[PDB]
Write an enzyme that holds these catalytic residues in place. Structure first.
Site, PDB file in Angstrom:
ATOM      1  N   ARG A 121      83.720  83.258 109.490  1.00 25.37           N
ATOM      2  CA  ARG A 121      84.480  84.010 110.486  1.00 25.37           C
ATOM      3  C   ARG A 121      84.453  83.334 111.866  1.00 25.37           C
ATOM      4  NH1 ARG A 121      82.650  88.666 107.817  1.00 25.37           N
ATOM      5  NH2 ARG A 121      80.687  88.485 109.007  1.00 25.37           N
ATOM      6  N   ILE A 122      83.247  83.071 112.356  1.00 24.94           N
ATOM      7  CA  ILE A 122      83.103  82.456 113.668  1.00 24.94           C
ATOM      8  C   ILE A 122      83.403  80.963 113.604  1.00 24.94           C
ATOM      9  CG2 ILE A 122      81.534  81.974 115.583  1.00 24.94           C
ATOM     10  CD1 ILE A 122      79.976  84.567 114.567  1.00 24.94           C
ATOM     11  N   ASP A 172      80.327  73.308 104.399  1.00 27.65           N
ATOM     12  CA  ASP A 172      80.069  74.633 103.848  1.00 27.65           C
ATOM     13  C   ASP A 172      79.900  74.593 102.327  1.00 27.65           C
ATOM     14  OD1 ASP A 172      80.332  77.399 103.093  1.00 27.65           O
ATOM     15  OD2 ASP A 172      80.943  77.691 105.150  1.00 27.65           O
ATOM     16  N   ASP A 228      72.258  80.228 122.504  1.00 21.90           N
ATOM     17  CA  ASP A 228      72.425  81.650 122.819  1.00 21.90           C
ATOM     18  C   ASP A 228      71.419  82.479 122.027  1.00 21.90           C
ATOM     19  OD1 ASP A 228      73.804  84.054 123.862  1.00 21.90           O
ATOM     20  OD2 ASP A 228      74.516  84.298 121.797  1.00 21.90           O
ATOM     21  N   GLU A 285      62.780  86.072 121.237  1.00 19.10           N
ATOM     22  CA  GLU A 285      63.697  86.812 122.102  1.00 19.10           C
ATOM     23  C   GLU A 285      63.123  88.141 122.593  1.00 19.10           C
ATOM     24  OE1 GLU A 285      67.671  87.255 120.509  1.00 19.10           O
ATOM     25  OE2 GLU A 285      67.681  85.165 119.807  1.00 19.10           O
ATOM     26  N   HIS A 307      71.409  85.705 124.177  1.00 19.74           N
ATOM     27  CA  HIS A 307      72.052  86.334 123.020  1.00 19.74           C
ATOM     28  C   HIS A 307      73.240  87.196 123.447  1.00 19.74           C
ATOM     29  CE1 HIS A 307      71.000  87.844 118.696  1.00 19.74           C
ATOM     30  NE2 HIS A 307      72.301  87.692 118.862  1.00 19.74           N
ATOM     31  N   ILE A 308      74.162  86.578 124.177  1.00 18.03           N
ATOM     32  CA  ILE A 308      75.346  87.271 124.669  1.00 18.03           C
ATOM     33  C   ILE A 308      76.634  86.914 123.921  1.00 18.03           C
ATOM     34  CG2 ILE A 308      74.435  87.718 126.957  1.00 18.03           C
ATOM     35  CD1 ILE A 308      75.954  85.183 127.909  1.00 18.03           C
ATOM     36  N   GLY A 309      76.488  86.229 122.789  1.00 16.77           N
ATOM     37  CA  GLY A 309      77.631  85.844 121.979  1.00 16.77           C
ATOM     38  C   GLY A 309      78.647  86.960 121.769  1.00 16.77           C
ATOM     39  N   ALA A 310      78.167  88.166 121.485  1.00 13.89           N
ATOM     40  CA  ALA A 310      79.054  89.311 121.260  1.00 13.89           C
ATOM     41  C   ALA A 310      79.221  90.189 122.500  1.00 13.89           C
ATOM     42  CB  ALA A 310      78.522  90.154 120.097  1.00 13.89           C
TER      43      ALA A 310
HETATM   44  N1  NAD Z   1      75.100  85.042 119.092  1.00 13.11           N
HETATM   45  C1  NAD Z   1      75.577  86.265 118.883  1.00 13.11           C
HETATM   46  O1  NAD Z   1      75.611  87.144 119.743  1.00 13.11           O
HETATM   47  C2  NAD Z   1      76.071  86.532 117.459  1.00 13.11           C
HETATM   48  C3  NAD Z   1      76.917  87.607 117.205  1.00 13.11           C
HETATM   49  C4  NAD Z   1      77.382  87.862 115.918  1.00 13.11           C
HETATM   50  C5  NAD Z   1      76.995  87.036 114.868  1.00 13.11           C
HETATM   51  N2  NAD Z   1      76.139  85.953 115.114  1.00 13.11           N
HETATM   52  C6  NAD Z   1      75.727  85.048 114.018  1.00 13.11           C
HETATM   53  O2  NAD Z   1      76.714  84.029 113.789  1.00 13.11           O
HETATM   54  C7  NAD Z   1      76.435  83.465 112.494  1.00 13.11           C
HETATM   55  C8  NAD Z   1      77.757  83.372 111.730  1.00 13.11           C
HETATM   56  O3  NAD Z   1      78.390  84.649 111.605  1.00 13.11           O
HETATM   57  P1  NAD Z   1      79.744  84.776 110.742  1.00 13.11           P
HETATM   58  O4  NAD Z   1      80.293  86.129 110.987  1.00 13.11           O
HETATM   59  O5  NAD Z   1      80.605  83.606 111.020  1.00 13.11           O
HETATM   60  O6  NAD Z   1      79.193  84.674 109.233  1.00 13.11           O
HETATM   61  P2  NAD Z   1      80.184  84.574 107.969  1.00 13.11           P
HETATM   62  O7  NAD Z   1      79.488  85.230 106.840  1.00 13.11           O
HETATM   63  O8  NAD Z   1      81.526  85.067 108.350  1.00 13.11           O
HETATM   64  O9  NAD Z   1      80.264  82.994 107.678  1.00 13.11           O
HETATM   65  C9  NAD Z   1      79.073  82.275 107.352  1.00 13.11           C
HETATM   66  C10 NAD Z   1      79.410  80.915 106.738  1.00 13.11           C
HETATM   67  O10 NAD Z   1      78.175  80.213 106.520  1.00 13.11           O
HETATM   68  C11 NAD Z   1      78.325  79.540 105.262  1.00 13.11           C
HETATM   69  N3  NAD Z   1      76.994  79.113 104.771  1.00 13.11           N
HETATM   70  C12 NAD Z   1      76.131  79.839 104.062  1.00 13.11           C
HETATM   71  N4  NAD Z   1      75.032  79.129 103.823  1.00 13.11           N
HETATM   72  C13 NAD Z   1      75.196  77.933 104.382  1.00 13.11           C
HETATM   73  C14 NAD Z   1      74.420  76.784 104.469  1.00 13.11           C
HETATM   74  N5  NAD Z   1      73.226  76.732 103.885  1.00 13.11           N
HETATM   75  N6  NAD Z   1      74.899  75.720 105.131  1.00 13.11           N
HETATM   76  C15 NAD Z   1      76.094  75.744 105.699  1.00 13.11           C
HETATM   77  N7  NAD Z   1      76.857  76.821 105.634  1.00 13.11           N
HETATM   78  C16 NAD Z   1      76.444  77.923 104.989  1.00 13.11           C
HETATM   79  C17 NAD Z   1      78.971  80.630 104.407  1.00 13.11           C
HETATM   80  O11 NAD Z   1      79.549  80.033 103.242  1.00 13.11           O
HETATM   81  C18 NAD Z   1      80.074  81.076 105.366  1.00 13.11           C
HETATM   82  O12 NAD Z   1      81.215  80.219 105.264  1.00 13.11           O
HETATM   83  C19 NAD Z   1      75.443  84.411 111.812  1.00 13.11           C
HETATM   84  O13 NAD Z   1      74.107  83.913 111.925  1.00 13.11           O
HETATM   85  C20 NAD Z   1      75.595  85.687 112.637  1.00 13.11           C
HETATM   86  O14 NAD Z   1      74.411  86.488 112.586  1.00 13.11           O
HETATM   87  C21 NAD Z   1      75.678  85.703 116.414  1.00 13.11           C
END
Ligand code: NAD
Ligand code: NAD
Lengths: 304, 302
Positions: free
Chosen positions: B149-150, B169, B254, B259, B278-281
């Protein structure tokens, strides 16, 4: 033929000169006396912001064909003296267009997401998540004042961020605006409808203090101002007042009316501003590009 | 059916519940006590990082059908106690995706151009023009580890910024890659060829300390590392060493393994790192989409 390089120049740029078969004399930042002695037998001179190419220097260069500045502006070159002797004066503004645009965008991100602020707090042992609440840029409207070389690049990047583009230029380039899906409007409309206003105009009598109290008050209270053009384009005092009273939400600035900025300057006391020391063109790529660009221009004039 | 609201939510959000024909009980950040009596009649509860949904609470609500978190992560919710009673728990991941992506990019810019550094110095009365030579991003290669997603949003932004995109991936989606002209490659290749390496994977067994000493050595000495996923994905000690030794040029972070960060943590000493709490969101937009997304879930179910 000889070219005097009186400032630091990239290897590839020097290489362009040599590959053309020109002799290169390389001594950075000579004083006038020494410079006058170095230009006697040269067909060209390449400088950065220094040294100063004065009339005395020019009148002492019988063979001089071109004076080249690796960068923007010719404030250190006596353009009148050059003109009198029929000497061409060239520069490389296009070399840093992308880098200035990228900094403008970087400043926008830092202000909108309070990144410098949060980083600054972190180093003080403070975890300021609660006050690092910022804004998402996708879908926002960015108002670009001055749709030229840098303004165009910013529009390119804005379009990359999914932002709505507003442009205001006394001399609108319709073709380029269409390429970035930008719409031309009057300055009032841009100021009133933009969430981010970024300045990219040259400094002329017409733009001196272009951003003043009157126009700051027209901007949204939630708006952010970015200035990477020139200090004097923005009325510092009016901007300080706008920030204090909350007429706008923040500002990202790379240029000022006093450079360097004086100690304890009012602008440095706001948490909602991000200030940089006129580093818009400060990328190794932009610096190399400017050197190579003027080297090529020098070659074309001389050997052609 | 009735829905309780124990955190600050939004006009649009509150209303989508009433449109479905539910009743709304709203108090900003309540407490286990009053929380017990409030959830007693409600069939649903909604929250953010707070309030805290303990097991004691889950028990007070006999009618409670679903627990919703307006955001990501359920650390403040006893998901097991709920799993026992059969109470479904949900959140809104998609709601913050763009905001996290934009922070990663903003961090890339701040590190690449030494923006936070330059600003910090300015406030100390220092004009560090000559210490702030940075790098231009157009034409550079960005390596996206975790094309989800991100990761997708980052690639979308990067592709348009004129950057060359590499993706790694375990579960590659070729069609989505084509959408942002990204090229899938093995992890070693991505690390060796990228100018910017940004992490977007979840914290799972295979991603713990994924960015370790060995992989950091593989990266370019001029490369930048960005981590907006989870602290544990990166070996902090290995990163500090990489920065100290100059194995990479800098980093934007971030998230951390600690933390809040400790007082004199070694990461806070590098001029070539940009740290955010941790302000990503943390954007009003993300916060709103979150409340609205869970509201739709609370409705679809009841
Ligand atoms: N910093 C913030 O404030 C904040 C906010 C929300 C989410 N996040 C974090 O961002 C990260 C990504 O979130 P997302 O919504 O994109 O997740 P997602 O599930 O939408 O996508 C994750 C991707 O990682 C891939 N993946 C899994 N294992 C892997 C590996 N060993 N090596 C490489 N790729 C691998 C999966 O196939 C998938 O394509 C997560 O850790 C989530 O907790 C951070
Ligand atoms: N911060 C840095 O490190 C850095 C580096 C390079 C250049 N600069 C400065 O930033 C600006 C860069 O501009 P550029 O290279 O795109 O110049 P440019 O000449 O390529 O474009 C300038 C545009 O401004 C328009 N314009 C002129 N007067 C205007 C007005 N009154 N209102 C609105 N628009 C007007 C012109 O029509 C033109 O389209 C200049 O001020 C330049 O000196 C800063």
């Amino acid at each position: 033929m000889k070219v005097l390089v009186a400032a630091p120049l990239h290897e590839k740029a020097i290489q362009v000169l040599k590959d053309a078969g020109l002799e290169v004399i390389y001594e950075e930042y000579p004083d006038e006396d020494r410079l006058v002695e170095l230009v006697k037998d040269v067909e060209a001179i390449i400088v950065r912001s220094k040294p100063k190419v004065t009339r005395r220097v020019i009148e002492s260069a019988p063979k001089l064909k071109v004076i080249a500045r690796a960068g923007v502006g010719l404030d250190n070159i006596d353009v009148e003296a050059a003109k009198e002797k029929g000497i061409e004066v060239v520069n490389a503004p296009a070399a840093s267009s992308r880098s200035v645009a990228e900094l403008a965008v970087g400043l926008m991100f830092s202000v909108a997401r309070k990144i410098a602020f949060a980083d600054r707090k972190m180093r003080e042992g403070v975890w300021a998540k609660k006050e690092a609440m910022g804004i998402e840029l996708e879908g926002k409207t960015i108002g670009i004042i001055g749709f030229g070389r840098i303004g165009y690049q910013v529009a390119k990047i804005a379009n990359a961020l999914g932002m709505n583009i507003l442009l205001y230029d006394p001399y609108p380039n319709e073709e380029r605006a269409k390429e970035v899906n930008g719409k031309f409007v009057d300055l009032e409309t841009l100021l009133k409808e933009s969430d981010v206003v970024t300045i990219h105009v040259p400094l002329v009598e017409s733009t001196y203090h272009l951003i003043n109290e009157e126009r700051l008050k027209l901007m949204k209270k939630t708006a952010i101002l970015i200035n990477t053009s020139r200090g004097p384009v923005v009325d510092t005092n009016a901007l300080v007042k706008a920030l204090k009273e909350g007429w706008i939400a923040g500002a990202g600035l790379d240029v000022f009316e006093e450079e360097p900025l004086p100690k304890d300057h009012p602008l440095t006391k706001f948490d909602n501003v991000v200030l940089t020391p006129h580093i818009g063109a400060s990328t190794v790529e932009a610096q190399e590009r400017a050197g190579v660009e003027v080297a090529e221009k020098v070659v074309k004039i001389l050997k052609g």
